[PDB]
A paper describes a structure:
To investigate the binding mode of antibody 2G1 on S trimer, we solved the cryo-electron microscopy (cryo-EM) structure of 2G1 in complex with S trimer at 2.7 Å resolution. Yet, the cryo-EM map density on the interface between RBD and 2G1 was smeared. So, we performed local refinement and improved the antibody-antigen interface resolution to 3.2 Å, enabling reliable analysis of the interactions between the RBD and 2G1. For detailed analysis of the interface, antibody 2G1 binds to tip area of RBD of S trimer, overlapping with the ACE2 binding site on RBD and offset from the major mutational hotspots in VOCs. The heavy chain of 2G1 interacts with RBD mainly through three complementarity-determining regions (CDRs), named CDRH1 (residues 30–35), CDRH2 (residues 50–65), and CDRH3 (residues 98–111). The light chain of 2G1 participates interaction mainly through two CDRs, CDRL1 (residues 23 to 36) and CDRL3 (residues 91–100). The interface between RBD and 2G1 is stabilized by an extensive hydrophobic interaction network. Phe486 on the RBD top loop interacts with Tyr33, Tyr52 on heavy chain and Tyr34, Tyr93, and Trp99 on light chain through hydrophobic and/or π–π interactions simultaneously. CDRH1 and CDRH3 of the 2G1 heavy chain were positioned above the LA-binding pocket in the adjacent RBD’.
Receptor binding domain (RBD) on the S protein is a determinant that mediates the binding of SARS-CoV-2 to the angiotensin converting enzyme 2 (ACE2). Here we describe a monoclonal antibody, 2G1, that neutralizes all current VOCs and has surprising tolerance to mutations adjacent to or within its interaction epitope. Cryo-electron microscopy structure showed that 2G1 bound to the tip of receptor binding domain (RBD) of spike protein with small contact interface but strong hydrophobic effect, which resulted in nanomolar to sub-nanomolar affinities to spike proteins. The epitope of 2G1 on RBD partially overlaps with angiotensin converting enzyme 2 (ACE2) interface, which enables 2G1 to block interaction between RBD and ACE2.
Residue numbers in the entry:
A (entry chain B): 347 to 543
B (entry chain C): 14 to 70, 76 to 395
C (entry chain C): 544 to 618, 633 to 642
D (entry chain I): 11 to 224
E (entry chain M): 3 to 213
The structure:
Amino acid sequence: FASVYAWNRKRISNCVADYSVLYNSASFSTFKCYGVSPTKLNDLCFTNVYADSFVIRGDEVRQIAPGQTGKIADYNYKLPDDFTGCVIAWNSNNLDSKVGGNYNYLYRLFRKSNLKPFERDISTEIYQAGSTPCNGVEGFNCYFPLQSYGFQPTNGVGYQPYRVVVLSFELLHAPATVCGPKKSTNLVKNKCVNFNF
Amino acid sequence: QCVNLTTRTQLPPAYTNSFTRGVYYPDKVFRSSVLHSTQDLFLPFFSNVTWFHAIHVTKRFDNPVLPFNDGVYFASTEKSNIIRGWIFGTTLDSKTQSLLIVNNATNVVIKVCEFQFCNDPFLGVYYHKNNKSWMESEFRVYSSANNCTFEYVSQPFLMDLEGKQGNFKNLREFVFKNIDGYFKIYSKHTPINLVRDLPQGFSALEPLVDLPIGINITRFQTLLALHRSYLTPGDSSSGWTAGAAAYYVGYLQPRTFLLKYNENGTITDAVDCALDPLSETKCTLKSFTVEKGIYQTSNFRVQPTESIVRFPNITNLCPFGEVFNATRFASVYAWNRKRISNCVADYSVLYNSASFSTFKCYGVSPTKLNDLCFTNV
Amino acid sequence: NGLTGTGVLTESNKKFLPFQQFGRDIADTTDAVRDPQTLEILDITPCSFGGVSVITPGTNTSNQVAVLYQDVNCTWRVYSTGSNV
Amino acid sequence: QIQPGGSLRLSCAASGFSFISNYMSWVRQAPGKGLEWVSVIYSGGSTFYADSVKGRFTISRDKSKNTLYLQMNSLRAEDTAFYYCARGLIRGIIMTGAFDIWDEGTMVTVSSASTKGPSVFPLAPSSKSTSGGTAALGCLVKDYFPEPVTVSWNSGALTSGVHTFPAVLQSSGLYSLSSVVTVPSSSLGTQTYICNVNHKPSNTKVDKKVEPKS
Amino acid sequence: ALTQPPSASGSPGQSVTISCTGTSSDVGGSNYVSWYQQHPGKAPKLMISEVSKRPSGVPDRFSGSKSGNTASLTVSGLQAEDEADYYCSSYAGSNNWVFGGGTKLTVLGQPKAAPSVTLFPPSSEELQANKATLVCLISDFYPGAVTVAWKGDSSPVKAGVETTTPSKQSNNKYAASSYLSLTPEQWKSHRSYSCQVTHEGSTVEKTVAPT
Ligand SMILES: *[C@@H]1O[C@H](CO)[C@@H](O[C@@H]2O[C@H](CO)[C@@H](O)[C@H](O)[C@H]2NC(C)=O)[C@H](O)[C@H]1NC(C)=O
Ligand SMILES: *[C@@H]1O[C@H](CO)[C@@H](O[C@@H]2O[C@H](CO)[C@@H](O)[C@H](O)[C@H]2NC(C)=O)[C@H](O)[C@H]1NC(C)=O
Ligand SMILES: CCCCC/C=C\C/C=C/CCCCCCCC(=O)O
Ligand SMILES: *[C@@H]1O[C@H](CO)[C@@H](O)[C@H](O)[C@H]1NC(C)=O
Ligand SMILES: *[C@@H]1O[C@H](CO)[C@@H](O)[C@H](O)[C@H]1NC(C)=O
Ligand SMILES: *[C@@H]1O[C@H](CO)[C@@H](O)[C@H](O)[C@H]1NC(C)=O
Ligand SMILES: *[C@@H]1O[C@H](CO)[C@@H](O)[C@H](O)[C@H]1NC(C)=O
Ligand SMILES: *[C@@H]1O[C@H](CO)[C@@H](O)[C@H](O)[C@H]1NC(C)=O
Ligand SMILES: *[C@@H]1O[C@H](CO)[C@@H](O)[C@H](O)[C@H]1NC(C)=O
Ligand SMILES: *[C@@H]1O[C@H](CO)[C@@H](O)[C@H](O)[C@H]1NC(C)=O
Ligand SMILES: *[C@@H]1O[C@H](CO)[C@@H](O)[C@H](O)[C@H]1NC(C)=O
């Protein structure tokens, strides 16, 4: 996947959304939808589908929600207050950890201001905590703004790495291309019918 | 390949009026024979837009760095394809990510990576007489492009690039918005026949694209094309001819408009419900015609000019390290209770010392914790 | 002290007891406040005030209009001044 | 002691260090002048050194246990000083820029020649030292390394006016001092005034008589 | 380095000031100025933090301020025992970290004393020893901020001189000594030398001529 400070964003185009094929391949343990109920997912068509993905600590999974504070939600990944998609996260200690620690995963620790929703800050300029500048060297009151998680395999759960996918989309209003597993019928005109368009 | 141009004359800026320009379809729903009231980022009616040109003979190649406040209405009157695109960003100097929309003579290129832009970015067309052709020669925009995130390249084509000598025949209008990491572009092309001073009329811009770029934007700059031929001796920084084009820039603000859809579904007119009291009444009446009389409008409003904050004189930081970092806690049947007095609540200092995994507030939202004062802590 | 708002601040004659910080009117809006650094009382007055009417001869005849500010006395809180006041 | 061109290991304890903003500078002090900064280590792995030291000294922290190492290499014998471990003071994430915990330091001496015996001269009583009823005479004992040295007057007899001044450390690296005593000017040469010089690290014992100038 | 005057003292139960008067870009161009304290034998102890702040302990007689390129300390009330050195300190530009010079702070409850000076020329045996040393002894000068200057016939000299730091005697006043290195041909070259000592503005000098 990707680390959280430079998070990936994949575009989901014209395809069929059958999420039952996942029933035998992976469990989740966090799966929350926001603009829509989970019982009507395979009955709708979705307009702008995007899939963000990253890896965070197990304790920070609660931060992936609208209206949150903390290290991830302040300046690593911010959701809007009118969010619509679904948030999914699963434990990944058997994959993304190794003996001695896996330092391929980073996070931002210092910033001047909070992020706006759905922006990305991949700059590595040295954060100035003091009044005197420091001209691009680390030292007195100047820190490198990115740190690494330490993922050794026997950690307390919640220090173990979690993979998080955020599904973003829209409903009705515009043309869609995803749809669910529903099957179509013929067009009956000039009669009273229930319809699903 | 990056030059600082010269042989440019000095002039003050020019301004113009926007005669009810810059309206776009605010959703993707079809409406017919109706008047719809909508609030959004619009260009106010009869606004003072800024005017930029480039006519040589006097040379005038305007492409300064302009603010991008809340959105931009951009209009271009041309005949020979001089404006080619824009660059958007905050510093434009490879310490931050920037967006580039450009039109080569063959493709449209959109790229959102780390560019090192020049002081005078441009393109350049060369004109031969021996060979019967204007051809695209220079592309001098950036020096480097390191950590790209988004990229799109259109299907190939070939533009004309040929220099005309008549009057401005093409008007192209764009609206640029940037919200929730989406860069939205609305566009409209119109055939005109004009000499200067962006015209009057009404045409609604249709949605062009939404790019998921996710960057911060506060400034932007226009990309113009240059002309070089056997009559431009120079060396490479004085031997250029400008051409002929003009473009106008205005800024959007949040307004309420009343749009009119004809029977075919086209927006043909609009009322700016905050331009005058007359328009206030037109808009509260939901009609374009007002009958003789006297009408009550809203009370007289005054807008705030400044923002002030007044907190008490507190210097210390709260004991975050002797509450969360204690050595030995208490058992639950005899639980401890510490009194928090006059101190500063900076809970960001905990961001690198301890994770939590349960943190729930009850009377207050977590996004307003460092904006309040607390009484009995 | 965390309480946000909009208005005009003026020097006050109210005098708070030491355990008081805000003052409220009958509609329960905050109309007085003690400044937390200078310990002086201030009154907070709203900013919008006064009715406005527009007189038109009909927009099917002209778009000339007149405006009546029902709370102004000129001998200003107006949108424009033009001529013929 | 260590001859120049050597090396030395100075170690201290970085208890509670891995949090960022935890500077642990090192500061020297010459025996008599005053304080002077030497080096600094920042907990994000950054090292910085003062001038006139740079390239010869190196900090290499042990992230294994907790121990902090300053390796001095090729000492120039103008570094003889107490060396302190100054731990910083932090106001949250902001380094305050002051050192609150010290450690009493280690004495680091750099010399040469090892040891040496004193050279003695008698400083005669003179009219330029004479004033009215009294005149002063003494003994100058100079150029010795092994610090503890003693000079008595007349095998310990005279205790009046006998004052031995603190030894001085020259640029040559050897000590020197002079002990003087006043005695009535009527008694310039009259009685015995013999300074007994004893050097205890060596075995030097010499008696020198002081008499008025010829 | 920075500058602070090496001697300042006053009556017990009063206010004494100490100026640090650095340049710009360490003291004027910053705000991280501190003050320490070193009793004669112990480690330094942080006495005043940034500008004007205190740790715990540190009884509120000590105060600090900054007025540009000069920060200053002020002790309001000498109890009996605040004799120290009081180094001021600052963070300079590039992680530099500069220091001060140190000011002794006594409290002569009685009346100042006069530095008794005594000067000796190189003995005869030393003349025969192909060398020469002038000996300047200072004694009994209560308040210890003495300094010394050496003189050839008319000019000052600054080479070949060593100066002891003041040392406390039994009577709890001070003593010091200085040595001048000379080749005997330079000893007879100049017609006379002298040692001068300055102490609280006042000055006393002694002089000797070769034979
Ligand atoms: C174009 O002109 C600009 C000045 O307007 C030149 O800018 C400086 O560039 C150097 C690096 O080469 C920087 O260190 C300076 O800080 C810049 N100063 C300013 C005022 O910008 C630029 O070098 C010129 N480039 C060319 C090709 O002429
Ligand atoms: C809060 O701090 C301000 C300064 O930051 C203090 O204001 C001073 O007030 C005294 C009145 O006794 C004036 O003489 C000073 O000139 C003020 N200083 C400034 C910079 O304006 C204020 O006193 C502090 N609050 C309290 C309760 O003391
Ligand atoms: C020392 C007690 C001071 C209490 C101040 C009173 C109110 C201010 C509330 C602060 C909430 C602190 C929670 C820490 C959130 C960090 C989230 C994370 O870990 O990512
Ligand atoms: C956008 O960039 C500007 C640079 O001037 C910066 O001040 C601002 O904080 C950035 N946006 C956010 C939301 O921080
Ligand atoms: C636009 O604003 C400028 C600002 O000074 C002013 O000079 C100019 O007259 C304005 N133009 C119009 C048409 O109001
Ligand atoms: C125009 O620029 C894009 C940017 O990479 C490039 O891919 C394209 O090939 C260029 N046009 C032509 C005709 O090569
Ligand atoms: C036209 O001639 C120019 C040289 O004058 C050459 O660079 C260019 O490639 C030629 N183009 C064609 C189509 O011949
Ligand atoms: C951007 O480039 C820098 C330097 O080449 C590199 O350190 C950094 O990892 C790059 N960004 C990403 C997301 O890899
Ligand atoms: C749409 O309406 C216009 C007049 O407003 C009319 O000229 C045109 O024919 C209509 N379009 C059609 C034919 O659907
Ligand atoms: C408390 O802080 C110390 C560092 O001072 C750290 O080593 C320890 O792990 C912390 N313990 C808790 C419970 O925070
Ligand atoms: C007002 O305009 C309408 C349509 O243009 C017209 O039918 C009407 O007659 C006009 N009013 C008068 C009084 O003529």
